[PDB]
Write a protein that binds this ligand. Structure first.
Ligand SMILES: CS(=O)(=O)NC1CCCC1
Ligand SMILES: [Zn+2]
Ligand SMILES: [Zn+2]
Length: 581
């Protein structure tokens, strides 16, 4: 408790000594509360006018238009301690999994140089004054002296400045210095691809949306039961102190300074947290707790993948009858669990696709469906089903939800097979119509529109409305203007290369599931979904609104070209049969 967090709490007190006060009307039940002080401040979603002017039929579709308009009683809940048998299964599994992930990888520190390069190319590092932006702090030796002071404090096993700022979501911003120290110690998990499919067997880190359907189809080829895709209710809030101790065992594979710097992140910032929260009644609350997930988003992704892989292997063990009860593992159940892992562990990992809190599992058989005691006792309670009701599985890989998508098998006129990503088209159009942040020029707004258009051409070319809208936006934005994003899966659409050349490289040349490497010479060789399937997944094909939009698209393109002004444009519409004379 307060020996580890006191220094941080002490330092904050003094900077607001004029305002400090132990409030009595504090709303916290499960957070430890320490004091309050005076503040006064809050970024809503803005519309992208280039994309909206070129998607007129969607102006009257509420699922699209409502997306642009506008639980913290889950952060203030508690998770019970797992039983002794559960804690044993988790420790054995976690020990075994870090060894497997570490067989072909070497833990190592990430560098100031590496951190500086990621800040100077727009990452979402989630930092918060003294310098304007992160770009400025990073080019100033004063910052690195602050970093140095905290760094030596961490080697000494103590913390002064690593404090969270709060804002079914929750993003915990720290100052850039704290982020550096986190990245220095644990950045290797992402930077060296510990959760790649080749390294982790269950993982999909660095797999583009163009690979995920092929991966699910490969899992479907295994003998076994249904495919299960159970979502957890509020994964980050169900991370237990036992979970955080099993994650910290990655430090057992480290040495020297690195080992000590990583041990300090886990001990001082993850297993003990200090957070500042805006309360309207406007004070700042300084609260603490030991458990739940609060790390940078990239480290959170890798540790969520780790703990999800562990939890799903244990649910598979329960279904296969490896252990009888979570109350207590006998001496010989421990050896049975260890022996299962050594004997079939890697095969069972290959039966899963795991992306942080999101999973798909094809178990050995459907006993998995009702194997719920370990999963419930680890606190990974399933969303939108009663605690003890058996899971409903999927009989067809093309129906399974994963990473907010489903996947279609699409046969090209020439016989080759594409496995393509898909989601309801209202969600895709409604997201492309939204920007984040202030001070967008017309050129910057146009370049963000172009980024969405090129993603659609690469991932969603099979949706009639999106191929047409993508061609229209690319015709409306100057040909040489570079696609942009403010928060940056692989992003092959972020380029000024011709999109047909990029399509060929992604779907044909570099596609390990495509044996025939014959290049496609035109967009007309590239197929669509069936017309009825396109409607099922939200197409407006068949509506009068959509027909008038498609017929008159050159008028929409010319409206946007007139706003942007006298620039160099390319007509991409004749790449589609109906505008090709
Ligand atoms: C703090 S983190 O390791 O989760 N994220 C990094 C911060 C800078 C680049 C990514
Ligand atoms: Zn610290
Ligand atoms: Zn679909």
């Amino acid at each position: 408790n307060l020996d580890i967090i006191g220094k941080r709490i002490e330092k904050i007190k003094q900077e607001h000594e004029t305002s400090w006060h132990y409030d009595q009307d504090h709303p916290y039940k499960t957070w430890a509360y320490h004091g309050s002080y005076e503040t006064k401040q809050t970024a809503s979603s803005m519309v992208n006018g280039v994309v909206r002017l070129l998607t007129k039929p969607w102006d009257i579709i509420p699922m699209v238009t409502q997306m642009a308009m506008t639980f913290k009683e889950k952060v203030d809940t508690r998770t019970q301690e797992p039983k002794e048998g559960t804690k044993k299964l988790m420790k054995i599994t976690a020990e075994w999994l870090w060894k497997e992930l570490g067989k072909k990888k070497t833990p190592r520190m990430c560098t100031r140089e590496e951190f500086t390069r990621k800040v100077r190319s727009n990452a979402a590092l989630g930092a918060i004054n003294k310098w304007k932006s992160a770009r400025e702090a990073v080019e100033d030796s004063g910052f690195w002296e602050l970093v140095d002071k905290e760094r030596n404090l961490h080697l000494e096993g103590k913390c002064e400045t690593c404090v969270y700022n709060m804002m079914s979501r929750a993003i915990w911003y720290m100052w850039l210095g704290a982020r550096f120290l986190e990245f220095e110690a644990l950045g290797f998990l992402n930077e060296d691809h510990w959760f790649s499919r080749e390294n982790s067997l269950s993982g999909v880190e660095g797999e583009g949306l163009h690979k995920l359907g092929y991966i699910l189809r490969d899992v479907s080829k295994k003998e076994g039961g249904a495919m299960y895709a159970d979502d957890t209710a509020g994964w980050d809030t169900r991370i237990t102190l036992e979970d955080l101790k099993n994650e910290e065992m990655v430090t057992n594979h480290m040495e020297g300074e690195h080992k000590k710097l990583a041990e300090a992140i886990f001990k001082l910032t993850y297993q003990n947290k200090v957070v500042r929260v805006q309360r309207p009644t406007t004070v700042m609350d300084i609260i603490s707790r030991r458990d739940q997930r609060g790390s940078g988003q990239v480290v959170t992704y890798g540790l969520n993948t780790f703990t999800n892989m562990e939890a799903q292997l244990i649910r598979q063990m329960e279904g296969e009858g490896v252990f009888k009860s979570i109350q207590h593992l006998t001496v010989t159940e421990e050896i049975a669990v260890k022996n299962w892992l050594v004997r079939v562990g890697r095969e069972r990992l290959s039966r899963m696709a795991i992306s942080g809190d999101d999973c798909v599992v094809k178990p050995l058989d459907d006993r998995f469906a009702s194997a719920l005691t370990a999963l419930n006792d680890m606190g990974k309670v399933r969303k939108d089903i009663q605690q003890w009701e058996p899971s409903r599985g999927w009989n067809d890989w093309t129906q399974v939800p994963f990473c907010s998508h489903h996947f279609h098998e699409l046969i090209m006129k020439d016989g080759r097979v594409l496995v393509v990503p898909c989601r309801n088209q209202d969600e895709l159009i409604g997201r492309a119509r939204i920007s984040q942040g202030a001070g967008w020029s017309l050129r910057e707004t146009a370049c963000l529109g172009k980024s969405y258009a090129q993603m659609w051409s690469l991932m969603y070319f099979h949706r009639r409305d999106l191929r047409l809208a993508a061609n229209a936006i690319c015709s409306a934005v100057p040909s040489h203007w570079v696609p942009t994003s403010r928060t940056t899966a692989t992003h092959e659409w972020m380029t000024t290369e011709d999109m047909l050349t990029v399509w060929n490289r992604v779907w044909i040349q570099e596609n390990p599931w495509m044996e025939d490497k014959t290049p496609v010479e035109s967009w007309e060789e590239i197929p669509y979904l069936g017309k009825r399937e396109d409607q099922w997944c939200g197409s407006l094909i068949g509506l009068t609104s959509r027909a008038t939009w498609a017929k008159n698209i050159q008028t929409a393109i010319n409206q946007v070209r007139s706003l942007i002004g006298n620039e160099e444009y390319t007509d991409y519409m004749p790449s589609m049969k109906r505008f090709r004379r």
